Amino acid sequence: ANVWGVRLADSLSSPTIETRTRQYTLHDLCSDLDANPGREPWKPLRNQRTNNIVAVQLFRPLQGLVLDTQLYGFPGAFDDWERFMREKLRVLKYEVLRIYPISNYSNEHVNVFVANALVGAFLSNQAFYDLLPLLIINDTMIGDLLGTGASLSQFFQSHGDVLEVAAGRKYLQMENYSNDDDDPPLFAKDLSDYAKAFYSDTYEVLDRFFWTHDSSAGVLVHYDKPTNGHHYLLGTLTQMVSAPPYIINATDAMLLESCLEQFSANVRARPAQPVTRLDQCYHLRWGAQYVGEDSLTYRLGVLSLLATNGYQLARPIPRQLTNRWLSSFVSQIMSDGVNETPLWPQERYVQIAYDSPSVVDGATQYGYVRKNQLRLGMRISALQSLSDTPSPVQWLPQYTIDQAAMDEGDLMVSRLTQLPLRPDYGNIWVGDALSYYVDYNRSHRVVLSSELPQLPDTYFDGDEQYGRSLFSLARKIGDRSLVKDTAVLKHAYQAIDPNTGKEYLRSRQSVAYFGASAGHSGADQPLVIEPWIQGKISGVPPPSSVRQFGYDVARGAIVDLARPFPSGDYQFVYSDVDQVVDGHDDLSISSGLVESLLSSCMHATAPGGSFVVKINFPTRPVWHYIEQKILPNITSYMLIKPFVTNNVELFFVAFGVHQHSSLTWTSGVYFFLVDHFYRYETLSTISRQLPSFGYVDDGSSVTGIETISIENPGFSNMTQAARIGISGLCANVGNARKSIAIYESHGARVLTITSRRSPASARRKSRLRYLPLIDPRSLEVQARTILPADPVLFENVSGASPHVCLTMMYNFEVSSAVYDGDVVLDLGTGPEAKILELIPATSPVTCVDIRPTAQPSGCWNVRTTFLELDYLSDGWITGVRGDIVTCMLSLGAAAAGKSMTFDAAFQQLIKVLSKSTANVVLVQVNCPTDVVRSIKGYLEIDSTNKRYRFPKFGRDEPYSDMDALEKICRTAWPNCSITWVPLSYDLRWTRLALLESTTLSSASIRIAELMYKYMPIMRIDIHGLPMEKRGNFIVGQNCSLVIPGFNAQDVFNCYFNSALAFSTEDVNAAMIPQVSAQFDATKGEWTLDMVFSDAGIYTMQALVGSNANPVSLGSFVVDSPDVDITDAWPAQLDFTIAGTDVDITVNPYYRLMTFVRIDGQWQIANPDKFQFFSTLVMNVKLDIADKYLLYYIRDVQSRDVGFYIQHPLQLLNTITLPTNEDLFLSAPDMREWAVKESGNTICILNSQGFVLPQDWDVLTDTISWSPSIPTYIVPPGDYTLTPL
């Protein structure tokens, strides 16, 4: 590089080829006078932005035109100008031919100066007939001109050979030109008069002529070619300040254009391509006493010398610099700085570098000197296309050993900070919401109103409410209410009465919708209602009637449900009333009002009816009241909490209303409620850490965008200030991705780096002992432009891959496993080693992997250990001392690398463990604790080869049996205790993603959790007590445990499924269905034998003594029930309404239902079509579409459906059919289908305008899963359905 305000590339292009000179001939003169249309010389010039001609490009000749343009009077229209010019040329051509016969001299030489002067006279319509003999060049244009003495001194004047005048204009300004920025500058080429320069045969005699000749005008010339011989340019009084805002002398303007042309030549330099002139730069021969170094002219001369050396500007160069671009370039040159090029001008001779690439020095014969000692140490390079970029992109950053004061970095940041401004918040969460639905279970042990937990007081805290509102703003989803009603309605349509053996819901029963709300939206009714009316809701049977209530809804009765009112009796009641409560203290009064609401629902409902009420507020008193007066009234009940945002609101469903019931709370329901409270507490805590939505970011947030702008930075040596700012930005990012954009405004290009700071990144920054420095060679390498951008809080909406999510789960688990005063070892450590940032500085940690790391450890406040040895390498452990070791996300990779079986890899690992000394050891393990179950689209698991192959990550890693590993571990350490790690049931790792501003998706998280069940992390401690196990950890399988040497005084509490299962102190209320643990009088052994209602992880803990301090033994999981099922299909089918019955035998734990897969969406088939009954037989009526329809039976005993069992009814799809028998006919799909009878099409069903055949019968209610799809009755025959 940067000299003054201009930074240039050290790599330069210097061409060695120049085009050969050609003499002019009489035939050339004739051809030019002819001005052939095929190649008319004149070129129109258009403003670049407009593309509209505003000027004329000027070639040869017409270079003798020096008069005022007003005298010329050129036609405004370009085409009209051409026509007039062509007429003039034709007439002039006849005249020239008459004066000299073409035959006499076809290619004879003529005076170019004379030709140009004649052009001027003809244009001004002056007589050149006198000069016509002078036109022919006899011998020397100089000699012939010296002889001539005729004409005005003004028309043309030569002092001997020397003659000073203006050559023809390079460009002609047209009328359209407005001196616009988009308009190209003509650099005074358009001026009719720009300057007069003296042409002469010999430079030395010319100088003698100029010995006292005025040089205030000054002389700078391109000595490479004498257009008509050596010409001495002299600066005139006239100067141009037309360019905003600089004022420019004619000399400076000419030099600038020539210099820009030379730089352009260097940019497109081609090795075999010839140049117009090796010397394309004017050099000042005279006027040196009038020339100063600070002047633009002097810097321009240095630049001209650089162009001669081939120097290339660091800033990207357009093929044509814009007038605005030229002005900006001038502004940067105007920036004053030390000139990086060492060239200093000498009028003694033109100076040539010894090593310069171009051959101009060899070409030069006079006035040019190359210094042999003069050598420039710069490489030669020319770049390819360098177009601009709209948005910033990440730049790879590498740190350096140099250290600096933090204060200097802060000051540098303040100099370059972009703070502060408001970015768009974006959405923390998007997509569908999670809704939790429970219903009465007789098997479930009854729970008391007292057992249920009270709602937290914080729920009504105003700050908490503002935080929930902030989540609602950060949560992106469709109207929560409409989707919730549809889901609840579908579940209600799934209700079946057990004693009846038929579904509780009867379609077309009287319907009640409480407080339907039109809203200020202008919908005029509940959104859910419109689709139900249109039959647009899947799984909804057609309603005989729909009752609407509510002041807001125009359709609904306009009323407030605050007090009792007259209303109709409806079999189904749905409570959607807007709720207004006087106060949270009034919530007790509000609970009484809700009791009144329930009583009103009862009065509205028909006998044996049912009703639905959202649990807007859950209170222990509320449950107590419902229990005291309402549990008998309704035969059945269900609760669903649809959660889009964190809140304690619930939905209550009442079944068999007006039918006496013993409905009461159950242990499972209570645990579900506890789960809801814990989950809400976690969501609320995360919301309490939430940043302001679309607030003005001043950089205060620990997690906040970090971006700064650098303009015209010079990296040739140590900028330091730029380096300090970059180092500070890197410290703020803490390894965050940063996008950089360089854009030019206010005359200068500016590069802005954009990133986001984080609390974890902040922890890394705090863990830096000293302020580090970085190398900018890559930045100096950077030579590109990026357009400016507007800040938004969320970088992107992509979210995290299931593999990324699982890595996060593992990272969160490790941090929870992070504890005080612990030496650490990490297996499979990456170059980034993000775990080190997570780990606190006080305790030492070890990073080990086959691949070398990419991070720098000098800045760390505390010593950090990284080993460059294969993560599976051996013998280093024997040298190393061991306290704690981790093997995360590397165990499968280790097996793949060594090609070992998982059991074999584990034994090699046991040998390493023999090398290892860690008291506590955690290793990520591919352990199929659960029965192998594949997740479609992510991973493929092989039973034959025990390995997990993930198509999503395209890798295969083996898995091994847990029992053998456990036995090996006990052998390795007798006291070793290994606990199954429960990542699931926790969203805190998801909260870590939120700390990373990363949105989370339930499906990917669930897939990761399933993989973790088959790929758990093994937590092992050398110090432990082995426990007696001969029992079967399977559902309905008793487990036999003994705890010898213990005492009755000791009380043991064991937790399972995230719940304390039992405590030896109080088995009377103990949750486990059968709990037997007794201290042995003879040995103190506590024999634990239990009956397990539910399989799953049971916490292992050792408790001794009255005080009891909890220490956890290795956890275990009870095996879940078999997915095996038996289906009996009869060979002969009944196509009558009675239908065929298929026996189903399945594990008792699993209950399965079948939903048609419709358009890629599972849609339960028509409830009427299939009647579930006993083996188990669901009675489904055979339909013609069934042959064209694919069905599967899936386990439905849980909210997750079919995970254990999803068997397609292929037999039903392929059933053979009999012509004599009649089978119900429904459309396979809504699209047109052709009915064919014995190869004769009966009709087209789903065809536009179709009228059912009178002989044809229509089932009053279709058997099709879709009610719109039609079931028909037809005579015996051969039938086929084809879609159209």
Q: Can you describe what's shown?
A:
The chain is α+β, with helices and mostly antiparallel strands. The strands form 21 sheets. The protein has a seven-stranded mixed β-sheet, with helices on one face. It has a six-stranded mixed β-sheet with strand order 19-25-26-24-23-22, sandwiched between helices. α22 crosses α29 and α26 (902-915) runs parallel beside α27 (962-972). The chain starts with 7 loop residues before the first strand and ends with a strand. The PDB classes it as virus like particle. Keywords: orthoreovirus, virus like particle. The entry is titled "DLP 5 fold". The protein is mRNA (guanine-N(7)-)-methyltransferase.
Short summary:
Pfam families: Reovirus_L2_4th, Reovirus_L2_6th, Reovirus_L2_7th, Reovirus_L2_8th, Reovirus_L2_GTase, Reovirus_L2_MT1, Reovirus_L2_MT2, Reovirus_L2_N. Keywords: ATP-binding, Capsid protein, GTP-binding, Methyltransferase, mRNA capping, mRNA processing, Multifunctional enzyme, Nucleotide-binding, Nucleotidyltransferase, Outer capsid protein, S-adenosyl-L-methionine, Transferase, Virion. This protein has 1284 residues and is of the alpha+beta class.
